[PDB]
DNA sequence: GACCCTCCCCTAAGGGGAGGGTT
DNA sequence: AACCCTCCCCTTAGGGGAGGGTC
C-alpha cells in the first residue's frame, strides 16, 4: 500500500511517517529505486499499533525505541511511574496556589503582595540577642552595635551583596516585649567579645514577600503570609527573618524604602 | 549596579536577564551607549519578584507579558485553572494504566495483547442480523450476503480502506446459539432486499486489541479486554465489534491472519 | 585578573511551505 | 488534477561557546 492510503489506515499524518522513517522507528517494506516511493504492508500496521500503545502512556521516542527493539528492560518502566507520581503532586500544588490567588484578587481587584518560594544558602553572621520594649528603640540601638564590632575587629569585610536581617524568636507576636536578634553577614571568622558573637546560619527554603513604604504597615505583611501557609498546606518550621534593602542609609523619602519578609516552611 | 551583581541579588543567570531585556520584559534602567553596558537599580528587584511569582504558577512568557500591563484582564487565570485540572485527570489515568501494565507483565514473562484507545467515525453500512448455532456455520454462510447485494445493486462501490465487521448483540459472551449481525461499509445508499438492510453506524471511542493467527483462540482476546475495562475504571457502552483485516481471501497460511477486537468504552 | 558585549547554533516532535517529477 | 519526493526554516525558555573590547 502507498503512503497516502497507509496514512488513512492508521489515521496519522504523512509527515509523521516521514519522521518515523528518518528516526528509524518504522521503516517501509519496499522503496522504489528511481522514484523513491514508500510501500507498506500489514505487519507495519501490527507495529504501529504497538507504537501508539506505548506513546499513549507518556514514553518518549527514545524509550519507545528501546522498549520495542531491545530486551524487556523492565527498569525503564518503573522510572516512569515515579516521574508521574512526582508530577501529579506538583500540579496538585499549583491548583491550590492559584485558587488562593483568585480568592484574594476577586476580593480586592488589586494585589499589594506577591509571594514566591526561593532558596537562601547558609551564611556566616555576627549577631546580638536581646529583649526590646519597642521596635523604634531597637532601630536606635543597633548602629552603636555596628560601630563597636566594625572598629574592634581586623579585616571585617561585608558580603556582596549586603545581607542584614533580624530574627524573631517569639511564637506569637506582641508589642510589649520582643525577643529579637540582629544579624549581619560577613566573610570570615574572628574573635568574639561583649554581647555580640559570630555564628553560622544554615540554608532554608522560604516563601518571601517584599514590602515597600514605611515600617508602620509591616504587620500587614505578616497577616498575609500567615494566611498563605494556612491555605496551601505548608508548615512553619523555623523563626522568620526580616531583611533590610533600602532605608535611611541610602534614601531620604520613607515612602520609597524597601524591605523583605521571609518565612521558612515545609510541605505538610 | 552592574549586571553581574544584580544577577547575584536576583539569584538567576545573566542569559536570563539578556533574554528578558530582548523580549521586552524588565528592560534595564540605564544603558551606556559607548560601551553598551547594563545598569540596574533597586527598582528592578520588585518587578523581578513579580515575574518569578507569576512564573511559579505555570504561566508562559507571553501570558506574563500580557498580565503585568493589562492587569484588568483576568480570564487568563481561569483559562489556566481549567487546564491544570485537565492535566491532573490525564496523569491520574496514565498512572493506573502503567500500574495495570506492570501488574500484567509481573507474573507472565511476556504479553501478546497491547490495548490502545482510538476514534472511529460514523459510517454507512449494509447489514444482516440473525442467529447461528456456531461460528463455523457463520463463516460458511457469509459469502452469499456479499454476492446478493452486488447482484441486485449495480454500481455499488466499497470504501477506501475497507471496513468489514460483525456485531455481537448478546449481553453475555457465549459459544453457541449466538445472536450476530454482519456489516460492511459502502459509499452510497441503496434499497433493501429481504433481511438485508441499509443503515448508519455512529461514531465511537474504543479500546482496541489486534489478534493474529487462527480464529479459534479469539476468545482469549475477549477475556483480556474484559479485564482492562474492570482494572482501569472504565464502563462498556455498546456491543463489541470484530473487524477483519487479513484472512483466507488474501493468504493460505492461517498463521498470518489478522483481526481486531474493539470495545466502545467510557471513562466512568 | 575580572567583566562585559554581540553573533551563531542547539534543544522534542513534528508543521508549513517552495520547487521539481510522473501519470 | 492527483500523488509523491527532498530541502529549508519554525515553534519553548533559555544554554553553550567564540571572538573581541572595557574596567
Ligand atoms: C551595623 C548595624 C547596622 C547597619 Sb545599617 C545597613 C548597612 C548595610 C546594608 C543595609 C543596612 C546603616 C544605618 C545608618 C547608616 C549607615 C548604615 C541598618 C539601620 C537600621 C535598620 C537596619 C539596618 C550597619 C552596620
Ligand atoms: C461481503 C461479505 C464477505 C466479504 Sb470477505 C473480505 C474480502 C476482502 C476484504 C475483507 C473481507 C470474502 C471471503 C472469501 C471470499 C470472498 C470474500 C469475509 C468472509 C468471512 C469473514 C470475514 C470476511 C466481503 C463482502
Numbering used by the authors:
A (entry chain G), B (entry chain H): 2 to 269
Q: Can you list sentences taken from the study reporting this PDB entry?
A:
Bacterial RNA polymerase (RNAP) holoenzyme initiates transcription by recognizing the conserved –35 and –10 promoter elements that are optimally separated by a 17-bp spacer. The MerR family of transcriptional regulators activate suboptimal 19–20 bp spacer promoters in response to myriad cellular signals, ranging from heavy metals to drug-like compounds. Here we report one crystal structure of a multidrug-sensing MerR family regulator EcmrR and nine cryo-electron microscopy structures that capture the EcmrR-dependent transcription process from promoter opening to initial transcription to RNA elongation. These structures reveal that EcmrR is a dual ligand-binding factor that reshapes the suboptimal 19-bp spacer DNA to enable optimal promoter recognition, sustains promoter remodeling to stabilize initial transcribing complexes, and finally dissociates from the promoter to reverse DNA remodeling and facilitate the transition to elongation.
When including ribonucleoside triphosphates (rNTPs) in the complexes (see METHOD DETAILS), we obtained two structures of the RNAP-promoter initial transcribing complexes (RPitc) containing either a 3-nt de novo synthesized RNA transcript on the heteroduplex DNA scaffold (hereinafter designated EcmrR-RPitc-3nt) or a 4-nt RNA transcript on a fully complementary DNA scaffold (hereinafter designated EcmrR-RPitc-4nt). Unlike site I, which is occupied by TPSb+ in all of the three EcmrR-RNAP-promoter complexes, site II in EcmrR-RPitc-3nt is vacant when CHAPSO was omitted during sample preparation, indicating that site II might have different selectivity for ligands compared with site I and that its occupancy is not essential for EcmrR-mediated transcription activation.
